[PDB]
């Protein structure tokens, strides 16, 4: 039957125009009473590598 999109994946991952899988950055909202401002600041998105191939495959649809 129709395959099912993985809502866990859809809620925390985005596929870009060129088929890249772009996720947020781990480890910045829970224990930072003081990590370097450089640390907490360097939290934009990143690109998963050769294994978004798998993430891609559970969103397809």
């Amino acid at each position: 039957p129709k395959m099912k999109t993985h809502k866990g994946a859809k809620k925390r991952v985005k596929i870009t125009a060129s088929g890249k899988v772009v996720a947020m950055k781990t480890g910045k909202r829970h224990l930072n009473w003081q990590k370097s401002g450089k640390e907490i600041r360097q939290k934009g998105r990143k690109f998963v590598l050769a294994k978004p191939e798998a993430e891609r495959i559970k969103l397809l649809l």
């Binding site: 866990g8 925390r12 998105r45």
Partner: peptide
């Protein structure tokens, strides 16, 4: 797995 990343797309409905 990599169900260890935190959703941002906040506003899930």
């Amino acid at each position: 797995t990599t169900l260890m990343r935190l959703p941002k797309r906040g506003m899930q409905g």
